[PDB]
Design a binder for these strands. Structure first.
Length: 50
RNA sequence: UGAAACUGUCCUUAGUGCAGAUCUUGGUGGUAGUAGCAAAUACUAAGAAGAGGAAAAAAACAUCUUAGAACUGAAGAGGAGA
């Protein structure tokens, strides 16, 4: 579970959904040690759902 | 270094000697890798093409398709004329 409210606290509104992708990319780099991170289209559609 | 013209002496002649004219023309510095590349709400994911996202996150990647999210809001960022 990624508590993204912690990362997106008081962040500029026009950069909240784009930044959520940047955080999930970074959490995948630090855990699997790979720089080739591919998002499933279902996850991206959920990040932008609101 | 340069490869085809030139020099010394006596007279004659002058478009004859530059540091200045906010001089003329051309070239070039410091400033300085500095000031800046901040109006027009906004982009994201997958795929394709391409030399052109690599990597100890180098956090950003132009074009086209699809999906999401959006703006002009019909006296329009629409469709046409002088």
């Amino acid at each position: 579970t990624i508590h993204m409210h912690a990362y997106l606290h008081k962040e500029s509104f026009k950069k909240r959904a784009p930044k959520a992708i940047k955080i999930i990319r970074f959490l995948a780099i630090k855990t699997m040690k790979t720089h080739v991170v591919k998002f499933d289209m279902g996850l991206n559609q959920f990040i932008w759902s609101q």
